[PDB]
Amino acid sequence: PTMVAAFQLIRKGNDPIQPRDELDYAANFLYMLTEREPDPVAARIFDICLTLHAEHTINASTFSAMVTASTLTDPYAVVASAVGTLAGPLHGGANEEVLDMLEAIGSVENVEPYLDHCIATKTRIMGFGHR
Amino acid sequence: SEFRPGLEGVPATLSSISFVDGQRGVLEYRGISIEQLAQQSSFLETAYLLIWGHLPTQQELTEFEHEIRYHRRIKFRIRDMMKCFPDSGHPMDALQASAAALGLFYSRRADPEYIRAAVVRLLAKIPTMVAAFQLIRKGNDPIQPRDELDYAANFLYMLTEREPDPVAARIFDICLTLHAEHTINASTFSAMVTASTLTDPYAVVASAVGTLAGPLHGGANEEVLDMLEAIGSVENVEPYLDHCIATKTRIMGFGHRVYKVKDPRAVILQNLAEQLFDIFGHDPYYEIAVAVEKAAAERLSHKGIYPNVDFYSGLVYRKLGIPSDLFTPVFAIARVAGWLAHWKEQLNENRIFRPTQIYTGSRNLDYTPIA
């Protein structure tokens, strides 16, 4: 999370906001990345989500991990290749297009027209469908 | 005939900001008595009525102050570039080059905010930007501006790392309000000239400050304080008065051609200077000033060259304790606001000024090589 908020604020171009070792992990992340002290409920929800983000099916992450794991070189290059392949499909992700469609909702009353258009489009419903 | 040496006296256009009349000593701030507003004036609301053209709303002023606060920050890469500057001279050429920042910072927006935003940006930024020059001139590390301090409060906390009482803050506010407005100025002339092409506000202010330098640049009240210090002993000023009278020069800090009716601004300056030298007691500088003033006043009684603002302002700066060579920066901090108001004015003025003149050289000769 440190290097994460680091690159984030680096994009911003401002001077670094050094973190503190007195805050909780979620609280420290919120503070360092946001320069503001948060409340507890959102942090508990974020921890629960990280738990939801914890485990999945046999991932290409884990696949390539076991693959390079036979080389027995170093965990560093392991995590490196994990990040390298973990990129979204063609630098495009389900969640990114999901938020894009959520923004594309725009108005609400016309939902029936967009619903019918997508029914004509016959795509896995935006915000609906796994493999 | 079309000959007038130096192009002096010709009126140009109906200005709607400054009402300069030397006879009655009447100050009409767009038609408003300077003292009348000044009794209940605020510099922020003053700029609001100057550029926005009228009294704003309370919530409007609060939002403007909040925006100025949030926009007060500075750039790290600029700070790195700042150390790259040379380290020899005075701040004149320093600021002259230093203005160029916005072009590499916030300048691609030739709109509703195109006039509303960049001015507020300059307002919220320029103070610490100018202060950094003196902060760094002696190789001293600078500190970020304050967060819970008022404008002049944060200014003191930065330029001196100390916070004084609010009385001096109100006094400095009044001082800024004093030099706040200016009459027709060659600075304002060049401001209209550059802004006539409707280029921008930022590069306009750039060329304006570039031309703002006087003969060898410098400042006047600084020379006034220099002469006052050079007086030395106060008692022997009368022999010095005669020695200076021998040279047929105007009395230093006295005898302005335009202002010659004992301007009430200078009267209030003397009164507040007495108030300060009372509340904080008189010093050797105060006693020497009083004695020299008495000697000069009893001396002439014939020219009306009176103690102007400059002497009292140098004294007030000493009572504050800042570098004497900073007078031109304060004068600019005052006049640039009026320049911006005049720019807002000339914005509607799509007249495209283009004068003409004469020449009386020789002509109709040939060219001969191997001279």
Add this chain to the structure above:
Amino acid sequence: SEFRPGLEGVPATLSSISFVDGQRGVLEYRGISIEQLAQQSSFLETAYLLIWGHLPTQQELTEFEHEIRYHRRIKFRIRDMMKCFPDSGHPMDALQASAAALGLFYSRRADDPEYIRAAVVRLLAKIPTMVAAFQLIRKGNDPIQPRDELDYAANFLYMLTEREPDPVAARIFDICLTLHAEHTINASTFSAMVTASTLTDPYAVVASAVGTLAGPLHANEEVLDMLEAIGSVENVEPYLDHCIATKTRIMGFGHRVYKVKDPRAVILQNLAEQLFDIFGHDPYYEIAVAVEKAAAERLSHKGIYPNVDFYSGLVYRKLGIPSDLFTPVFAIARVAGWLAHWKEQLNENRIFRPTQIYTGSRNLDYTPIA
């Protein structure tokens, strides 16, 4: 109680550093006829006539040739600090701030002849280095060492282009600069009169002059843009229809003062013909020639003809001049005028006075908080 708007016709001084006719198109460069001086003159003698005003001798000519070549270098720490600048916008304010630091590199403050000839020659030799650097700098290309082995214009072209210049092209460019080296009393000259009489510092004076050199929206660039966008010009019918609809004089074809088509454009067209003959026939140049012939076929009665800015853009594209360069090129050609100004403007010593009649509100009450 009369005052022509725009300060129209204020003969504040009878200038003695130039001469022009404007009726027969006689241009006496301080008394030097246009074609006569343009015949076989090098730049140094012309600059001496412009500023010093004396016909030069071979001795001082070689002296200046050697001395200027010596100070023809740029500071290494200048090359260092400049790396902190960004790389996005137009090079105008960049070149401004670049010329600005001359005070950080000079504090002569005057013998009076010293910083009237020494710092003067320094500033004269200085600017082309900064310009060519910004050319290299703005893109992100490696610098080129300052070289006095080549000619001043040749070295400038070689450095800014990373490819050596040519002698006949150098002569043509020098002639074009000489034509562009002088205009009427300019808004730059207006700022000079606003400042140079006070004689603060010639360095900061030239700085402010170059800063204000940018015009309305910084023009001839748009003219060359229209010329290039033309390309194939078989649609002279829709072009004439749009011209009739606009009811505005086609920019780059017609001016305000010269009502007889100043022969500068005539010499430019003759040189353009010679160059197109020598450097081969560019099909785009052929299309441009056809378009210009079509324009002249209809503009003959109007007396307004395609300005030499067209031929200037033509030579620029033929030489391959960048976009912002033509503005920097114009800044380069004639900025020496501010030098002759400061020489004459400081030769006068009086304070300018801002005077006007304001007609705002006279007396109103400033309410306390209302």
Add this chain to the structure above:
Amino acid sequence: SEFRPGLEGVPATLSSISFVDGQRGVLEYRGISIEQLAQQSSFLETAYLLIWGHLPTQQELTEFEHEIRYHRRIKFRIRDMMKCFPDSGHPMDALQASAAALGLFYSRDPEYIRAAVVRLLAKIPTMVAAFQLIRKGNDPIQPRDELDYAANFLYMLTEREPDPVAARIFDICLTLHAEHTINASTFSAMVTASTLTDPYAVVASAVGTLAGPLHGGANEEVLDMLEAIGSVENVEPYLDHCIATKTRIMGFGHRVYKVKDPRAVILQNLAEQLFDIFGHDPYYEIAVAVEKAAAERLSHKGIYPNVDFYSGLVYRKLGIPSDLFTPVFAIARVAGWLAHWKEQLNENRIFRPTQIYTGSRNLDYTPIADR
């Protein structure tokens, strides 16, 4: 110096006609509050206060009632001369030419201070109704005095006698229209009537200038928009479209008072009473719906419907011709111009102000062979 451009704020003198203040909506007709004066008054005493300035008795009232009836007719040879006029142009220049001949009949002090006065007072409505019947070809009507002045006007212009309540409402409207602030008509009067030649050409020029900007005024466009209303359900789409138009909303907003001068309030109350008394009709229903919709949004802006909104309504309910509202207003306009001329010749001094000459000079003409 100082010159408020275009006669912006120059004061003429201490006007001696009436009194009016906008902050509280003070309308003191000859110093008497308009709302107070509006109770139970006839036009005779109001005109006496306007011109003569004295509250009259029943004696001179009956005297004028008889005398006006005596001079209530017009020349038949005048009708024959008018029969030579064309029948295609606008009624404005028609009425202008009609008045243009008053002096030819009555030509050539103390006695000529009430004779042509009362003559013109009785006359003009006859000329108006005559042009009305004339422009098409309907035969004229005999001049009558058995009916009331407004009743006679209605009978003449419409071939139908009016009703008493409608006559009272029309008189109230005329009283509201009786005068405005010192008007452009009054401006031209002051520009001309000081010369003290004759009231005839004075009233002529007053009516001529009374023509609206570009021979039209607000009421024409207001009634045009009212007719264009038609269907009611489309107001909201049109409301948003006009909100995107950025223009003075039709039937909303003027430049005189910021508090909706109670003239319009009395007009709206009378309109409500009248629409209640008479058949409501769908026109008034559409008007009520459109007015409610307009007021639903402009309440924050404080811009109120023009009196012309209710004026067109009253006109259409009565069935007033389109080109008539101009002379309809011109009636009370000349009524005010009466007191304008009365007080105007009292001042006896020619007016010829200066000017700012901006032309060139020192030029000369060349022959046509050179020019």
